[PDB]
Design a protein around this ligand. Structure first.
Ligand code: NI
Length: 341
């Protein structure tokens, strides 16, 4: 049965609610982004209207095989009418195609559903600023003060400089980047651009990237592994055993690997600035863990919510336990007392 936090009150809308079969009373199903926990349940068997971004629509058609008749793509930053209700899609600064949804309810209430997002100050100068938002459905993945991370830009600068030095020292070195879903494409795109290379990958991953509306994509990516000095592999293969095996597959064209493992937060964010990062090394393989996040840090989330000043917050992440719900409610109350709303 569909949770209250996936329902938009006073409409027949749901958000990211595809795993419960037919939701009683739902006339439009919104999908914020193409990550499997959010799309879970969608397939060629789905026969109700799905509303989403153009990129998400491309992935639904080509990867999940949802029939075109049921896909309703909407443009960004544009006031649209769905089933008689005014809505706007905004860029979520998450993965490609990911949106936040603003609902203007018939009774005058305004609701923002963030989907998954990485809060940014640029959001404070969007359409959100034009009117009071009453209710916020919030991505609370990192809603605790221990969760700090660097900017995406600091992480990319470190990755570019690391890769350029290693390949200039050894022109027979290969660069490998781990992946398991869409998102974090700038890691491998920026490394390949500094090296003057295309990115090589499997046919299944190439198919995915070709759905993302990236300008000039045909000049950036290839299925011809031999021709390229940056390769993509499943995140599970970024270990010494997997990378040795891969080296053997490539036909001696390379004699060394430098690999990147973009993660979320892991315990050591607590001490270590990006400039101090050192890799784990075994013989001719070196692996760097890089904290490249597509979710808000605690400080980023707190800034956005204190700017927005909602009357109610509904969390959408870590809502399955009491302990977690209670801890989040304590931070919301602090934020509200500090900022006066
Ligand atoms: Ni996500």
């Amino acid at each position: 049965t569909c949770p209250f936090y996936k329902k938009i009150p006073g409409t027949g809308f749901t958000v990211d609610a595809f795993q419960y079969g037919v939701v009683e009373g739902c006339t439009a199903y919104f999908l914020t982004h193409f990550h499997s926990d959010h799309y879970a349940g969608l397939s060629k068997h789905f026969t109700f209207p799905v509303y989403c971004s153009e990129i998400t629509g491309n992935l639904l058609k080509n990867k999940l095989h949802v029939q075109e008749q049921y896909i309703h793509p909407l443009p960004l930053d544009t006031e649209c009418i769905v089933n008689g209700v005014k809505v706007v899609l905004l860029d979520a600064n998450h993965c490609p195609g990911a949106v936040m949804i603003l609902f203007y309810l018939p009774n005058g209430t305004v609701i923002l559903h963030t989907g998954d997002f990485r809060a940014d100050p640029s959001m404070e100068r969007s359409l959100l600023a034009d009117q009071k938002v009453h209710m916020l459905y919030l991505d609370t993945t990192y809603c605790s003060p221990e969760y700090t991370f660097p900017s995406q830009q600091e992480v990319i600068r470190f990755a570019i400089n690391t890769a350029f030095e290693a390949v200039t020292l050894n022109p027979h070195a290969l660069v490998v980047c781990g992946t398991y879903s869409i998102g974090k494409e700038k890691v491998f795109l920026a490394i390949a651009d500094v090296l003057g290379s295309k990115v090589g990958m499997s046919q299944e991953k190439y198919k995915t990237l070709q759905c993302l509306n990236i300008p000039e994509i045909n000049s950036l990516i290839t299925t011809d592994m031999c021709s390229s000095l940056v390769h993509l592999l499943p995140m599970m293969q970024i270990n010494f055993k997997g990378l040795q095996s891969h080296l053997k597959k490539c036909g001696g064209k390379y004699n060394q690997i430098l690999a990147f493992r973009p993660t979320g937060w892991t315990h050591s964010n607590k001490f270590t600035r990006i400039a101090d990062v050192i890799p784990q090394t075994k013989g001719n393989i070196s692996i760097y863990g890089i904290p490249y996040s597509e979710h808000s840090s605690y400080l980023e989330m707190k800034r956005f919510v204190q700017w927005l000043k909602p009357q109610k917050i509904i969390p959408t992440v870590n809502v399955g336990t009491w302990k977690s719900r209670s801890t989040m409610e304590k931070y919301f109350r602090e934020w509200k007392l500090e900022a006066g709303y």
